[PDB]
Write a protein that binds this ligand. Structure first.
Ligand SMILES: *SCCNC(=O)CCNC(=O)[C@H](O)C(C)(C)COP(=O)(O)OP(=O)(O)OC[C@H]1O[C@@H](n2cnc3c(N)ncnc32)[C@H](O)[C@@H]1O
Ligand SMILES: *SCCNC(=O)CCNC(=O)[C@H](O)C(C)(C)COP(=O)(O)OP(=O)(O)OC[C@H]1O[C@@H](n2cnc3c(N)ncnc32)[C@H](O)[C@@H]1O
Lengths: 385, 384
């Protein structure tokens, strides 16, 4: 009904006028390469499975316009292993996106982290005016995470003002969330900042800004990670994750009653262990942080790659925040696209427009698993006020 | 080499900038469907193999620009039985062609014959301004045939002024050839006009134009067909075919020393029997008529449809009416042709081709090339 499978090439159908142009696009990639998960080398898959070409795989038709989902013919390790190659395949994808009508293109996942947050792309296309504008979409991602913090506190039966909040990963997304949360929601009583040892000075500057720029009056703690989070993080009652490193948090050690919002992909904790613990004990709440719930249902068209071949039954109201960011920039000129580490209060404009449009966070879920509403109510009966 | 196989979609490669745009396109179709498919239905091919989409299958890189070859997702019988659908899929292919750069698009094969010579396409594109221009390319086809007539007489040791010429099929292509032949080459001794019985009045008018308009002083004979060609046609020593019906001419009945230039597709005689007879007796010269020979080798990129001869192709050869779309984009005086146009711009095409050092392709029929030594034997037994 809201999900339609298309066996024919979306690009071919577009070029003969059988499907309309899109207004925006979002670039993704094929996860991570593991030699024990595939029959062939990395180079074989890139050349023969992905054909070294970007692949237009989905259309998301929202009330605010159409988004093409385009997959780069690369794994995440390829983006980091050669930034020049990453930029060149992204430029090939931007040329395709422009032909099919995109005006703005979102860089999802770790594409910003691997490309100087878009700046390496913008410099390589500065001499071109025929390509769509790029955005990391991270201000909208930041607002989706704050909306999820709001929702998981509501579903948990608690107020944020009583929480001890631990931030795991204070990179581009993480530092969009922390100031916006302080702007939009009641201040918690304690904030822990957790990142790797080499970012201690960076974290100490964040602590200064918490006191003197963002008006935070509660307790502040710094927690340095090595291969995993230090044990102090398990003192937090709300954990907010935005790491580029999987499984740094042991979900079996969070205390009963803990709320977890995580935009990390893969998650900073084990999804299968979190689900098992929730099914057995119903004593945590956990969710993706970057997903928005549109007030109107979204029509999704899906064209699977035959060689690469949870789509059906997927929630038709849900859309990823940074993907939707590209439509926000075309609909509302004030919501300018973002490249580089962008510091400022413009995230509040993303939060305000999302609320005026009656977006909220997606219902609590983690990859394939939706937390059933009765189990959430059981958690709330035991661990709320 | 000059032929390059590409396993990836040309359309995909173009949209990422790995293939440059083209200057023109030519539409074709997937031959004829019949129980020769032995394993798959017609609707299964159209719905699941062609996917009801045009298929960009080749690029030809010439010294005068690039042309995309695009196959319509239909068989030839589908074009005649349903002119409405044929126009609809052609307009879909024109939108793709415009996206990949084509300014002019040729309609090859029987597409003009089944679409009122492009008039039906022009009608349905109405006021749309986002599509490339179409052309039948038949004025360039006519120039290729006249160039082949010139070439087969060169190599046969014969001169046209002493020949008895029989035209089989006087449609769009055939009537581009005849006036142009009279204008560019020495007038033959005799001309026979052969078409279907229902076109008698049309042929009678051609005869009046031959004498009073084109200044032909030789003998003119009309000889209609009811199914196969009448016996009068076998009195001809040069036969020029352009029918939309196959196997109306019996190659076994032609006299020794007969020259045959055929643009029919499939041919109006049996290709198998023509080869067999030529090998055993070497008493006929026969060739395609619509094939041009470029002075420079053409580089071809081929993307074969994954479901469904090319490397054995002459890299100098290019089909006349395909090339016509490139001529229209290069030379603004060679206007595109839609409908039965007649006219005498045909000389311009012929003159431009000679200017560019084009000639007819070497004598060949489909996959078979007539060996140059067997051509010399013919010239000994039947030339001068
Ligand atoms: S489009 C919306 C973006 N989100 C998604 O697409 C879903 C998940 N996909 C991802 O690619 C990533 O998980 C993120 C995008 C969420 C990473 O975000 P980003 O902010 O762009 O990446 P960045 O490299 O700038 O910061 C990452 C952050 O994580 C810290 N970190 C690494 N290891 C640790 C440990 N062990 N503890 C704590 N922090 C850690 C990095 O040092 C860095 O600051
Ligand atoms: S790129 C240039 C186009 N040529 C080709 O692509 C190669 C061959 N492909 C074909 O589709 C056809 O063979 C032609 C294009 C050569 C057909 O020519 P055209 O002029 O466009 O078609 P039209 O229908 O206008 O005329 C055909 C002609 O043949 C007559 N005819 C039919 N049956 C007979 C018989 N038995 N005898 C004599 N003539 C016959 C038709 O009445 C009709 O007038």
């Amino acid at each position: 009904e809201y999900v339609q499978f298309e066996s024919r090439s979306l690009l071919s159908l577009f070029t003969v006028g059988k499907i309309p142009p899109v207004d925006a696009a979002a670039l993704c990639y094929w996860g991570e390469y593991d030699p024990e998960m595939f029959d062939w080398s990395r180079d074989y898959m890139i050349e023969n499975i992905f054909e070294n070409l970007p692949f237009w795989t989905m259309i998301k038709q929202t009330n605010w316009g159409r988004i093409a989902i385009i997959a780069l013919p690369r794994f995440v390790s390829d983006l980091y292993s050669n930034q020049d190659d990453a930029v060149q395949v992204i430029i090939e994808a931007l040329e395709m996106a422009g032909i099919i009508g995109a005006k703005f293109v979102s860089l999802t996942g770790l594409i910003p982290s691997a490309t100087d947050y878009g700046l390496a792309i913008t410099k390589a296309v500065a001499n071109r005016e025929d390509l769509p504008k790029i955005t990391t979409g991270h201000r909208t991602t930041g607002a989706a995470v704050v909306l999820t913090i709001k929702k998981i506190c509501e579903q948990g039966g608690r107020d944020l003002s009583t929480e001890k909040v631990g931030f795991i990963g204070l990179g581009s997304v993480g530092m969009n969330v922390l100031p916006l949360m302080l702007k939009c929601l009641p201040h918690p009583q304690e904030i822990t900042l957790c990142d790797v040892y080499s970012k201690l000075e960076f974290l100490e500057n964040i602590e200064q800004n918490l006191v003197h720029k963002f008006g935070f009056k509660g307790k502040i703690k710094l927690a340095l990670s090595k291969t995993t989070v230090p044990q102090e993080i398990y003192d937090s009652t709300l954990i907010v994750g935005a790491t580029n490193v999987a499984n740094v948090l042991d979900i079996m050690q969070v205390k009963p009653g803990t709320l977890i919002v995580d935009d990390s992909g893969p998650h900073c904790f084990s999804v299968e262990q979190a689900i098992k613990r929730f099914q057995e004990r119903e004593d945590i709440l956990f969710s993706e942080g970057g997903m928005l719930r549109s007030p109107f249902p979204i029509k999704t068209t899906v064209h699977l790659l035959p060689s690469v071949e949870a789509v059906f039954n997927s929630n038709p109201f849900n859309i990823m925040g940074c993907a939707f960011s590209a439509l926000l920039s075309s609909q509302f000129e004030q919501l300018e696209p973002t490249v580089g580490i962008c510091d400022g209060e413009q995230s509040e404009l993303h939060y305000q427009i999302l609320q005026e449009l009656e977006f909220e966070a997606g219902d609590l879920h983690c990859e394939h698993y939706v937390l059933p509403a009765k189990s959430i109510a059981n958690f709330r009966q035991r661990f709320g006020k």
